[PDB]
């Protein structure tokens, strides 16, 4: 009858080639591996907010917007009285790098970057404006702007 | 004298923001008021060389 | 010696069958009336 | 958390857990619930939202373990968008976050 | 010294797979309700 | 001195919250009042040890 | 009895022929290669508004 | 010493199933009644 | 002395691949919302 | 003093409830008022040993 015990012990051996402690070790090193996979070298940018004045002078310099990959940044435009200014139309250079969700009436601009170092330009026409506003968008900085509020002299 | 934090940094061009709120993009070879000359622009590590030897960098609180 | 292999084979058959029986758990039943 | 709208303050950070729902309830400073108008998300594959259209509540399900995201939200009477950071894998997970806004 | 190529082969396929996940970037969603 | 606690620990960035109600996220090398200069930030084990020898961790129970 | 340990560590080698730090430096060379690829030669032009 | 790979081979696929079980996580559900 | 010839093979596909990308330039889209 | 009993026991964490109505969850590394320092939490059998050897378990009638 001990031959049946031999059959039973090799039966358990071939039924479970994996030990419970082996399961523990594999799960631990797998979670470690996927953590190292998700972990990126280099410092992450600081989440910032800016309130900046747009100068529409015909000899001035256009404002610059820092961007981060995938994270949607919010742009809000306000006049000198602080009231938001709705937008007539807008146009984006390189639409493959950025996508804009914008309902037809509100002034909020939600911009998500798709490419890490591809940088673009933006032209916007407003409601009460004639002179358009031109901005530049640069990805890959050391501080990501969650929101940019734009005070306008108009 | 007006300080400048590094706002945007790419190879070639550089962006600085002044104390009063003044913004400026610059190229590699130019004379900076109050610092001397833009000596070398390094896109890596955010370091700008100056004829005075000064190193323009990102802000401590904005990093 | 081949009795070991035969016993292990049909033992594995039976063991896999009963662990298949133990693997599934069905679902609760609810009934209304008025 | 008392949410602030300073133009230089840090955005609030939301702890996430694998699969378990995180709830967020939004009120103003006086304590009345502020209804939510709309929102936008970063990385929709990691976060699933059952936003009922006429409430002040948000339900999030973090799908991945280490991928971190951002959120933008805006309320019915509110003009300024609110941006939030979403960080998974924290030792203090939040079954509920109260958001007392300064508006 | 023949183990190098078997060492080289699998991890390069592991390398080419992993970078493809690092090229994966999805869009956003504007959820609107009334 | 007001005790700060870690809000969220990632590699690279650190989120710390004190009893004053202000949350501050920092990089590795920065000057912080009451704790001197931060040299090292540990992405594991839930503590950050500064160059001043001072350790800020999470809460003992609110964690 | 150590046959099981040797099989387990060999299975670990088969599952992952790479160190996690090798994964991290692979991410580093991937990001640096992308930076070199999308880097542009020459001086970039100055944004101007004229009348 | 070919017996090492015999226990290596079956345990390769054996661990592959549980990590495939550990790969996925399914969605939450919402239910309104009135 | 065959290291040039294999490097002649791989880099030819790679250089033609990246130069396809620089010729790959996609146009803008005008958006009007009343 | 208030007697506590184990409500839920998992790997890593443990849940306990006193007679007053206060229910808490303790990890291995923490302290407990009225019982001291957690020496060992076992994920099986519902056995917790404190610093003074005090035993946390399920109730006699609630098992």
Q: DSSP characters for E1-34?
A: -THHHHHHHHHHHHHHHHHHHHT-----EEEE--
* CA angle (C23, C27, C32) in 5-degree steps: 170
| Integer CA distances (angstroms), D63 to B27, D87, H26, in order | 45, 12, 8
Q: How far is CA E33 from the centre of its chain?
A: 36
C21 in reach of chain A (CB within 8 A) = no
- Contact list in E for residue A114 (CB cut-off 8 A) is 25, 27
- Contact list in B for residue A143 (CB cut-off 8 A) is 58, 62-63
Return the structure tokens found at H11.
Answer: 């345990």
CB contact under 8 A, G14 and H8: yes
Contacts from J21-30 at CB under 8 Å and sequence distance 24+? J30/F60, J30/F61
Task: Give the bridge partners for D74, in sequence order.
Answer: D38
**DSSP annotation string for C1-34:** -HHHHHHHHHHHHHHHHHHHHHH-----------
Q: Tell the burial category of B2 from Cβ atoms under 10 Å away from its Cβ (0-12, 13-18, 19+).
A: exposed
G27 in reach of chain A (CB within 8 A) = yes
| Integer CA distances (angstroms), F55 to D12, D35, D76, in order | 23, 42, 44
Return the structure tokens found at J14.
Answer: 């443990």
Report the gap between the CA of G45 and the closest CA in chain A (Å). Answer: 13
Distance of alpha carbon G24 from alpha carbon J56, whole angstroms: 44
Which has the closest alpha carbon to A13: C11, D4, J38, E27?
A: C11
| Residue J36 and residue J52 in contact, taking contact as beta carbons nearer than 8 Å | yes
Distance of alpha carbon D97 from alpha carbon D103, whole angstroms: 18
H helix runs in B1-63, sequence order: none
| Residue H30 and residue G36 in contact, taking contact as beta carbons nearer than 8 Å | no
CA dihedral angle for residue J42, residue J46, residue J50, residue J54, rounded to 10 degrees = -150
Return the structure tokens found at A88.
Answer: 């007539």
Chain position carrying tokens 């007053």: J20
Distance of alpha carbon J32 from alpha carbon J55, whole angstroms: 13
CB contact under 8 A, C4 and A8: no
- Looking at residue I16, the DSSP 8-state letter turns out to be H
Which has the closest alpha carbon to D45: D20, D64, D58, D59?
A: D64
Distance of alpha carbon I31 from alpha carbon A123, whole angstroms: 11
Give the list of residues 6+ apart from residue D33 with CB closer than 8 angstroms, or none: D25, D26, D27, D56
E-only strand ranges, B1-63: 5-9, 14-17, 23-26, 31-32, 36-42, 47-50
| Residue G15 and residue H15 in contact, taking contact as beta carbons nearer than 8 Å | yes
G11 in the Ramachandran plot: left (φ > 0), alpha (ψ -120 to 50) or beta? alpha
Distance of alpha carbon D25 from alpha carbon D97, whole angstroms: 6
Chain position carrying tokens 């596909």: I13
Q: Tell the burial category of I22 from Cβ atoms under 10 Å away from its Cβ (0-12, 13-18, 19+).
A: exposed
Report the gap between the CA of H26 and the closest CA in chain G (Å). Answer: 25
CB contact under 8 A, A41 and G23: no
CB contact under 8 A, D61 and H30: no
Report the gap between the CA of F63 and the closest CA in chain A (Å). Answer: 21
B24 in reach of chain A (CB within 8 A) = yes
Report the gap between the CA of B20 and the closest CA in chain F (Å). Answer: 25
Return the structure tokens found at B3.
Answer: 């300080």
Give the list of residues 6+ apart from residue B58 with CB closer than 8 angstroms, or none: A142, A143, B5, B6, B46
- Looking at residue B46, the DSSP 8-state letter turns out to be G
Q: Helix, strand, or coil here: A33?
A: helix
Pairing of strands A143-152, B5-9: unpaired
Return the structure tokens found at I16.
Answer: 């033609």
Give the list of residues 6+ apart from residue D12 with CB closer than 8 angstroms, or none: D1, D3, D84, D85, D99, F23
Query: Rg of the Cα trace of chain F?
Result: 11
* CA angle (A143, D18, A67) in 5-degree steps: 15
Distance of alpha carbon D16 from alpha carbon D41, whole angstroms: 15
Chain D residue with minimal CA distance to A35?
D66
Chain position carrying tokens 């009336």: C33
Return the structure tokens found at F16.
Answer: 């710390």
Q: What is the 3-state secondary structure (H, E, C) of chain G?
A: CCHHHHHHHHHHHHHCCCCHHHHHHHHHHHHHHHHHHHCCCCCCCCCCCCC
F48 in the Ramachandran plot: left (φ > 0), alpha (ψ -120 to 50) or beta? beta
Residue F45, phi then psi, degrees to nearest 5? 65, 5
| Integer CA distances (angstroms), J36 to A153, D101, J4, in order | 65, 40, 13
A53 in the Ramachandran plot: left (φ > 0), alpha (ψ -120 to 50) or beta? beta
Give the list of residues 6+ apart from residue A89 with CB closer than 8 angstroms, or none: A124, A125, I30, I31, I32, I33
CB contact under 8 A, B11 and G47: no
Q: How many CB atoms lie within 10 A of CB A13?
A: 12
Q: How many CB atoms lie within 10 A of CB B59?
A: 14
Return the structure tokens found at A89.
Answer: 């139309």
Return the structure tokens found at E14.
Answer: 């592991």
- Contact list in I for residue A94 (CB cut-off 8 A) is 26, 28
**DSSP annotation string for J17-30:** EESSS-EEEE-SS-
Q: Helix, strand, or coil here: D98?
A: strand
Residue G19, phi then psi, degrees to nearest 5? -70, 150
Give the list of residues 6+ apart from residue F62 with CB closer than 8 angstroms, or none: D92, F5
D65 in reach of chain F (CB within 8 A) = no
| Residue G27 and residue G35 in contact, taking contact as beta carbons nearer than 8 Å | no
Which has the closest alpha carbon to A40: D33, F10, D97, B15?
A: F10
Distance of alpha carbon A114 from alpha carbon A96, whole angstroms: 7
Task: Give the bridge partners for E28, in sequence order.
Answer: none
A38 in reach of chain G (CB within 8 A) = no
Distance of alpha carbon E7 from alpha carbon D93, whole angstroms: 42
Which has the closest alpha carbon to D80: D97, D102, D56, D58?
A: D102
Which has the closest alpha carbon to D2: B42, F56, F17?
A: F17
- Looking at residue A69, the DSSP 8-state letter turns out to be B
Which has the closest alpha carbon to B4: A45, B15, A64?
A: B15
Chain position carrying tokens 């005790």: F3
| Residue A120 and residue A97 in contact, taking contact as beta carbons nearer than 8 Å | yes
Q: How was this structure determined?
A: cryo-EM
CB contact under 8 A, E18 and G17: no
Distance of alpha carbon H5 from alpha carbon B36, whole angstroms: 70
Chain position carrying tokens 């940088």: A119
Q: Return the exposure string of F27-40: e unless at least 16 CB atoms fall within 10 Å of the residue's CB, then b.
A: beebebeebeebee
Q: Tell the burial category of D80 from Cβ atoms under 10 Å away from its Cβ (0-12, 13-18, 19+).
A: middle
Give the list of residues 6+ apart from residue C18 with CB closer than 8 angstroms, or none: none
- Contact list in H for residue G8 (CB cut-off 8 A) is 11
Report the gap between the CA of D35 and the closest CA in chain E (Å). Answer: 10
Distance of alpha carbon I14 from alpha carbon F14, whole angstroms: 40
Pairing of strands F23-26, D2-3: unpaired
Distance of alpha carbon F17 from alpha carbon G9, whole angstroms: 43
G11 in reach of chain E (CB within 8 A) = no
Distance of alpha carbon A121 from alpha carbon D12, whole angstroms: 30
- Contact list in H for residue G7 (CB cut-off 8 A) is 4, 7-8, 11
| Integer CA distances (angstroms), A93 to A88, A124, I30, in order | 17, 12, 10
Q: How far is CA D2 from the centre of its chain?
A: 13
User: Touch between chain A and chain F (3+ CB pairs, < 8 Å)?
Assistant: yes
Which has the closest alpha carbon to F60: F21, F2, F15, F3?
A: F3
Distance of alpha carbon J41 from alpha carbon J28, whole angstroms: 6
Chain F residue with minimal CA distance to A42?
F12
Residue F15, phi then psi, degrees to nearest 5? -110, 120
G47 in reach of chain E (CB within 8 A) = no
């Amino acid at each position: 009858e001990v031959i049946d015990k031999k059959a039973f012990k090799d039966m358990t051996r071939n039924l479970y080639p994996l030990n419970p402690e082996q399961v523990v070790k594999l799960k631990q090193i797998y979670e470690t591996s996927e953590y190292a996979k998700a972990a990126t070298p280099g410092t992450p940018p600081k989440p910032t907010a800016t309130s900046q004045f747009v100068n529409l002078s015909p000899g001035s310099t256009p404002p610059v917007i820092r961007l981060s990959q995938g994270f949607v940044s919010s742009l809000v435009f306000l006049d000198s009285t602080g009231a938001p200014w709705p937008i007539a139309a807008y146009d984006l250079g390189d639409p493959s790098s950025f996508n804009i969700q914008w309902d037809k009436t509100s002034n909020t601009l939600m911009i998500q970057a798709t490419k890490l170092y591809n940088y673009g330009n933006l032209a916007v026409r407003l409601r009460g404006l004639n002179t358009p506003v031109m901005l530049t968008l640069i990805p890959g900085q050391k501080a990501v702007d969650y929101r940019v509020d734009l005070r306008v002299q108009g | 004298r007006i300080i400048y934090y590094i706002q945007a940094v790419i190879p070639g061009r550089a962006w600085l923001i002044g104390s009063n709120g003044s913004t400026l993009t610059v190229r590699e070879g130019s004379k900076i008021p109050g610092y001397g000359m833009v000596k070398l622009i390094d896109s890596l590590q955010g370091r700008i060389l100056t004829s005075s030897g000064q190193v323009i960098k990102f802000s401590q609180e904005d990093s | 010696q081949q009795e070991i292999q035969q016993r292990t084979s049909d033992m594995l058959t039976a063991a896999t069958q009963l662990v298949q029986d133990w693997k599934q758990v069905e679902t609760q039943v609810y009934t209304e009336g008025t």
